Amino acid sequence: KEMKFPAAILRGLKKKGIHHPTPIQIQGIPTILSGRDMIGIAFTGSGKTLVFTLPVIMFCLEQEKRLPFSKREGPYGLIICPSRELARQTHGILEYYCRLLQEDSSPLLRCALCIGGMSVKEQMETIRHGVHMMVATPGRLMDLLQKKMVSLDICRYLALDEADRMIDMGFEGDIRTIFSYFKGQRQTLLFSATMPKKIQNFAKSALVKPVTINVG
DSSP: OOOOOOOOHHHHHHHHHSSBTTTEEEETETTTTOOOOOEEESHHHHHHHHHHHHHHHHHHHHHHHTTTOOOOOOEEEEOOSHHHHHHHHHHHHHHHHHHHHHTTTTTOOOEEOOOSSOOOOHHHHHHOOOSSEEOOOOHHHHHHHHTTOOTTTTOEEEETTTTHHHTTTOOOOHHHHHHHHHHHEEEEEEESSSOOOHHHHHHHOOOSEEEEEOOO
């Protein structure tokens, strides 16, 4: 409730005609920080980044200000994608905003990519040094979790992007497996282009008392 976006965001949102936005609401529309799980039907890139990515980045920045003496590897937030290409571009966007918000007087948030087809070079440089946000595909993530190579203990925010596509592609078992590695409570956002029965049921499994934003 006391959270504010810094001036680069507030400036750029104002150019678009968005006045008085906060990390908990965008012109009265809730984000993932307002205490509810969410189902987001037919969102574009830009809508997803207002309701999920920017508000979670702010959460990361606030947590960084008073850390415990003995630190934990994050991430604080996780985005699960259907594909390598989509994970990489989603990961490039997060890095873009992470760079934008450092230059508003701070140190740099680090985003991990967790997908197949990463060289060992790419695998080391992402995971070791710090991880605040992670972007992954379901198979690779599951395998990292089971091999105890990644931890979800402080991960509060989860987005499932294109869950319809993920389920179509046969990743549902893999996502449920990932659900079982959350020890604490998560706030979960589900994105989908459409909402047939198949996904309605997966959402019942995956979410608790969700708010629904449907722009189809």
